[PDB]
Symmetry: D3
Subunit: 289 residues, 6 copies
């Protein structure tokens, strides 16, 4: 995509409600440190001290806008961060900058760190000649989904489904509960009348074929070794060429290339959200003359 146009995804109602809560979480009562700085007009520089990808400007902006501060970016959303970079400047009343400071920073650090891993992982795949979509999961922080999924998009990963209402994903537990894969997929297909796709976690070739026969649009190959994964995917694409194939389970940055192959459409990774460290940013006030 283009990372600058991604911001248009964020609906501005649910956005400001997020921002409000984040501020309240941090300053529920009186802001005593306000008195230290006073409210004089001020400027601070946003320092990027970690390599990766910048993401999260829409969140960073919104937070400060709520506090009557203005942000000037010196890079675009999505651009590569080359450490000790001065990536932006923030102007407003001192106390307002310093109240927004930590929250904006945390939001930007986390969003960026996710985008960073996603870009790293996308590269590694491109590098192995893979043409598919590296994806995320629902293994997001609670109440932080919007920021994390958006982060994955800025990094060039696909978001995967956002909600639980958005694609019907039959998993091991759904199959156990429904008493077998055929039964499960039949129900799943009925519930997704014509508007929603069905995906089915399958731990074996058999489970997959059963799923694919039953009319699954996607078959997720969960926890296969690579040497098992590709022959299994080959059989599937051969027999059901219109069915998409996702590999997930245990997949990391280091090993990702082994999971890439001509018959895998999607690779999903817990790690992009669950084990992607936050980038180091600071926001420092500089004096005017």
């Amino acid at each position: 995509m283009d990372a600058e146009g991604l911001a248009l995804l964020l609906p501005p109602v649910t956005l400001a409600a997020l921002v409000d809560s984040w501020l309240r979480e941090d300053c529920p009562g009186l802001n005593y440190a306000a008195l230290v700085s006073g409210a004089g007009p001020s400027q601070a520089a946003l320092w990027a001290k970690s390599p990766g990808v910048l993401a999260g400007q829409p969140f960073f902006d919104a937070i400060f806008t709520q506090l009557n501060c203005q942000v000037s970016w010196f890079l675009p959303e999505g651009s590569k961060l080359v450490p000790v970079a001065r990536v932006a400047e923030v102007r407003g009343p001192a106390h307002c900058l310093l109240l927004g400071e930590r929250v904006a920073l945390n939001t930007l650090a986390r969003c960026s760190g996710i985008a960073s891993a996603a870009a790293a992982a996308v590269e590694a795949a491109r590098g192995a000649g893979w043409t598919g979509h590296v994806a995320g999961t629902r293994k997001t922080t609670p109440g932080f989904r919007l920021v994390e999924k958006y982060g994955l998009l800025v990094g060039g990963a696909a978001s995967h489904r956002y909600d639980l209402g958005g694609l019907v994903m039959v998993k091991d537990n759904h199959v156990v509960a429904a008493g077998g894969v055929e039964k499960a997929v039949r129900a799943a297909r009925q519930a997704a009348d014509f508007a929603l796709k069905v995906e089915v976690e399958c731990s074996s070739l058999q489970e997959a074929v059963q799923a694919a026969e039953a009319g699954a649009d996607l078959v997720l190959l969960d926890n296969f070794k690579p040497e098992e994964l590709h022959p299994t995917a080959t059989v599937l694409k051969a027999q059901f060429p219109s069915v998409a194939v996702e590999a997930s389970g245990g997949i990391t940055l280091d090993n990702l290339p082994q999971f890439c192959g001509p018959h895998i459409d999607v690779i999903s990774m817990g790690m992009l959200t669950q084990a992607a460290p936050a980038l180091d940013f600071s926001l420092k006030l500089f004096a005017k003359e």
Copy 2:
């Protein structure tokens, strides 16, 4: 210090609210996946697949209570996870179990992941002879502070001030805006009447002394090499024996012992929250009764 007594810190109102919003994030509309599993009474086993410390039972319990499911814990809050362990059992209607599965796991993974890092770091400190307090920061995920600060406790580090509303904290930025460290602290110390303490970030011996003279209860030595840090702290404690010394900036699990000396009372670490990977948990239905 009992880690099972820690759930009492959680006020039940802010807890049940948080849980609602987590579930609403994940499934705002219709849960089509309820139709695949139906609603038969079922049981699921919680499996820990990562080493660390188990943290977040109160949140796990709340999530599932909200969905009319019950939880039996086989290990106490804060115990070591020795992997491929069966840590607990969850009971309830199938569709209800599966609705809360991900959000619960996410929450538990995230909280446990932090506890583990805190525990690692506390152990490191103990191992380097040091009886001070290892601590968190305000570098927490937005909307998720309660879980992360609670996690820090369960792992046995200190939370630090929760929310900018406890302790008053003067930083590089407050000093710049106030036109001096002398001015900044006097203002800070006026604001925090008797109820609140004043801590000051300082980047030199000089700036520390000025702070302590000015009436600082705590003096944070920001971003020192340990070779500078300890001589500095030695003088401070000589000249102002009742002023506490915190050290912060660049402190990893790797180098933490280097910042563990006899005149350092608090060590705060960004990494305990920012860069602690989540633990791997799963929740698998079984068909006993």
Copy 3:
């Protein structure tokens, strides 16, 4: 669709919150008519005074639950209503029973009113030997969508996309804004990726082909006369067998049979929500043994 299992689609959090907002709407302050009834143990009987389909038990139930009342139903959810029928008995404190009454009845009235129309539309389509799906739209009352979309399902219609983060729908205005049907569907598919279906509104056969060619999952044939619809449908189906066709616009109970064909998969009708008179119900306290 077994209509009694549909209640499993209702996540219990968003439900309970919605119930709260309805009761607060109807009684923001003090309930003065509490004093008129007092709080004597009491029982009322719900009478269905209109013909159609009973829908809304979950909502009815959950309103009374919030006011310590209990409901016992004598008809199953989705059953046929033959007038002057006793469908349930609600038991609880008089004042509570009387507080919930209008809100609970108003909820059951539209939900049933909508289901009734859906059932009638489905019946006319089965009646013209159509094996397709009758569907709702996003033409729903603001804030009431959960009840209305559930209503359609209980009457045997498809809900279409609930959401707008569900299926990606390119409409007449999108096509304009984009700058052409070709350029728009390219951009839709890219946003949709593997996770979502792209549906496109099309005013002619030419626009439909352009669309199918750009990779549309569903072509929606907007405001065609029946004489023009079916030729156009037959063409798309011969040339792109894997694309689903939707007819929509101007469709009524009376004319629906003329829109049924062997090459229409979905027919959506705005009237099913926008013009479905609410059923007559009432709740009258009786005396007990």
Copy 4:
């Protein structure tokens, strides 16, 4: 009355909140369709496609304001709508115009639908030479009451009580629970100390006299056939000239002239909110010259 000044009744806080819940209902997560339109400065025409009364302007406006879009109206609120008329022009970014489209349309459709049905009933009553008040009920869609009551006022009906903290209304059930009309009215008058009126639903002449005697500000005649209603009213009016008489139950636009008569003061009709079809409108983007 002036229909344009009714907007003053709408307190801008409850209006804005209401709008946000509607917006959030339609797009809880990510707006994928933003990418198809993009953010081009754009303009749309509001086409009125059904006959009736225009109502809902202040809500329509509020919605788009919340998305940074400006509305310009060509008909004033309350004017007669003559089909295929251009009533307004909405401008702003393309993605925003399309985000608010369906919600704003759905709001205006239903408010106008009601206004029309009220105006229609007001007209037939005027046509019978009746000078009383046609009225709404509390039979409103849950959560949508502010819009529906307002629609009644624009069509020139009277909203009954909005609220329930409103007028005190003693109904058949209140009378049953109390054990007797005179008891009930005593209790109701006590609760309505001097600030509220007391109304009593009465199913006979005998009960209506009991209630009038006991001091009710109004007597509602609950299901009378018209041949019975007017003698019962006449007797009431002669015996208690300062009591007001409401006729309710079964009153359709077709039979309304028969319920009009010199001794009825208020005629409340459930149909106005429960069975008023919504109007047809559409919002189509045009390019400028």
Copy 5:
């Protein structure tokens, strides 16, 4: 009446919501104090240390119910408090009792203090032979109206009009805005269609008469000396026998009998809410024997 049956006025939704804000206000973060008491099953005695009237049981209860505690009342709601009285007893986990303490005490203290003041006023009114209704105002604490108005009622005063939603009160300002008293009342009367009473603030016998002629249901005689009030009110009743006559403005508990007279129906008092000191209660843990 019966102060015990007043609790039925409080709808359980808006209670629990109110109680939740109050608790959140007091402990928005982690409750560190809970670790000092631990969770031992405990009991505590509520001690009334001031003279007055007890009011606020429903709130006190709700608060502790939310914290899983239970309350046994030794005196009924509305009874006379003779100091150092042991009025109730509260049981539940120690940290829960202690978390609820202050918030519940503050609530009961203020409700009780208002009911005391209202009683005092109702007494003096009765003592002076007057059969009217002492009333309060909209001079309530912001967001504490439910409790304050409830207190008035328990004290035996009237809750003058709760919300601005059910009576229509024309004031000095409304008249100025409207450009005269005739105009204002005329307008008000048309706004309050048949459901709502109109009250008019009048500062002179003229302005009162004018309002009465225009159709005012009540005439409020504002800031009159008593020697002016009673002649003014006698003319009023002479000409307008069915128009209620309220007196207001600087009426204190001391002079209240001077404002009592056969022609005054209602007496509102700012002081019942604005200057009613809180009672002194305390909650003391004891060991069981």
Copy 6:
């Protein structure tokens, strides 16, 4: 203090939330009174009818801002009010001023009442040559703590800790629950890692010392007569120089000077918030073309 620079303490999100709830409480539905005044541009004078200290401008401003109304203050926050003052002017639509009026007046009155009470007290203390802190308590009206604690500051008192997660307070009850003072304070000390202070309620010199020995930062001497208080305090300060001493319990404005001795640091007064009458203010519409 500098009373004008105190507004900076008020975070703008929590402020605008609070203000919305006040407005929603006072007019949840339709504002019939808007029709009486119309929307004409108007102005209103704010009159101060009582002596005291002016407090609550930020809340006042925010309230009106929310209703598109501007305020011009002719007196700085916290100035002395000398009665019949014209302290400010409010411009806006007529219906908007009148909707805001009472809510804002109510806020300003109780904020100003408290500031006044506190100024009275701080004055007597400064008059008694005392250099310590006059403080508040947590005996604040529920849901209104921000306004009341802010008012205390403006009048020159200290807020004290605001909520239960500032300083950690051990009271009679915490001691009972812990089974002793030693145990309770150790637990509070362990809980208050380094971020917080521990304060202990003590009813005797011995208990004060046990607390001081166990590491208490402050010792609150509850309910001592002045004759006991000072000699107790003189001993503490001798034997534990850096422990602070707060007196509290029964300290009226009248007797306060008796509590102002050289070994007392803090004096807390329940009365400042529990028994401080609100000041008298009106807002009157005046003329302009």
